[PDB]
């Protein structure tokens, strides 16, 4: 399953960010919510103007987020991962997500 890096993300730290992104020539809308007690980011994925999000999950490092969901016509077939740029023991935080902040959220697409 050859895959190539094709997109990177950044977060400003606002607890209720929402924006639209284009992946594999298809367009999706994303929502990020910050959880206080669990100090983690909650990601919701869905179609543009959809009534409810298609997928909701909790973000973690080195875990394939989309693994159990590559069976729907509206879910990207690529790979979405979070891995750190600094010390390997650093876990995902609020302000430490970005191309140079410490954690590299990235999307990669299979070659077809």
């Amino acid at each position: 399953r050859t895959v190539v890096r094709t997109f990177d993300f950044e977060l400003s730290g606002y607890p209720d960010e929402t924006f639209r992104v284009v992946l594999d020539s298809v367009t999706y809308e994303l929502r990020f919510m910050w959880n206080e007690r669990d100090e983690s980011w909650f990601m919701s994925l869905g179609d543009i103007g959809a009534q409810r999000p298609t997928i909701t999950s909790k973000l973690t490092c080195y875990s394939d987020i989309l693994a159990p969901y590559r069976y729907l016509d509206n879910v990207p077939d690529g790979n979405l991962y979070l891995w750190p740029l600094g010390d390997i023991r650093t876990r995902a935080g609020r302000f430490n997500i970005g191309p140079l902040k410490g954690i590299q959220m990235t999307y990669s697409s299979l070659i077809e």
Partner: protein
């Protein structure tokens, strides 16, 4: 007629064509000459053609045959590859009209500009040939503007356009509609195609700026 403009050290070609119209009004104090210029109007509106092809003909051959009829230099063309006609075809009338019809059914953009023929594919774009920033004489922040005055029904080819933005800059004739630009601002950042240009100028009094209508791209990087 040719026109040049710039800033006291150089002048870039900004238009070239034929004088379609000319009139003079001289009421009392000041005469005011008027012009209307067309970029290749004579060729695009009189080049007749009469061609035909049979089933199995490679489409790449049809394209080259029709362009040579138009009698203009080839600025840039993206061939079709190993595409072949599915049905017999016949072409008559103005060559430009026939080519513009082939555009719809094959997702290709055809447009002549400053004498150069440009044939490209919709959705895809060409490097950062231009960068826009406060150092590059930008004028005001970019704003999002729809690239068409109407909305189309959608299934919600997907690759087609449908989005855009607007920017303004000091006069710079070294830009063309089919080029690609990079937008380095504080809010918006990314790559865009160009779709429309408008050059304005008042020598003694008036603006000396250019306006670009950008369109988002979603295709391959041809």
């Amino acid at each position: 007629v040719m026109l040049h403009a710039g800033y006291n050290g150089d002048e870039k070609l900004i238009f070239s064509g034929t004088v379609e119209y000319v009139e003079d009004d001289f009421p009392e104090e000041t005469r005011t000459t008027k012009f209307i210029l067309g970029d290749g109007t004579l060729n695009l509106t009189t080049a007749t053609t009469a061609r035909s092809y049979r089933k199995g003909t490679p489409v790449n051959s049809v394209l080259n045959d029709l362009i040579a009829d138009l009698k203009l230099p080839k600025g840039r063309v993206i061939d079709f590859g190993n595409q072949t006609l599915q049905t017999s075809m016949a072409f008559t009338g103005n060559a430009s009209q026939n080519l513009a019809n082939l555009a719809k059914n094959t997702g290709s953009t055809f447009s002549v500009q400053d004498g150069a023929v440009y044939w490209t594919k919709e959705g895809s774009r060409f490097n950062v040939m231009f960068e826009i920033s406060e150092e590059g004489g930008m004028v005001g922040t970019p704003t999002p503007k729809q690239p068409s005055s109407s909305k189309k029904l959608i299934k919600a080819h997907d690759i087609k356009e449908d989005v855009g933005m607007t920017v303004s800059t000091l006069l710079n004739g070294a830009i063309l509609p089919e080029s690609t630009v990079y937008l380095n601002t504080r809010y918006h950042k990314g790559f865009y195609k160009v779709a429309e240009l408008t050059h304005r100028g008042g020598y003694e009094t008036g603006d000396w700026i250019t306006e670009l209508g950008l369109v988002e791209t979603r295709g391959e990087l041809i």
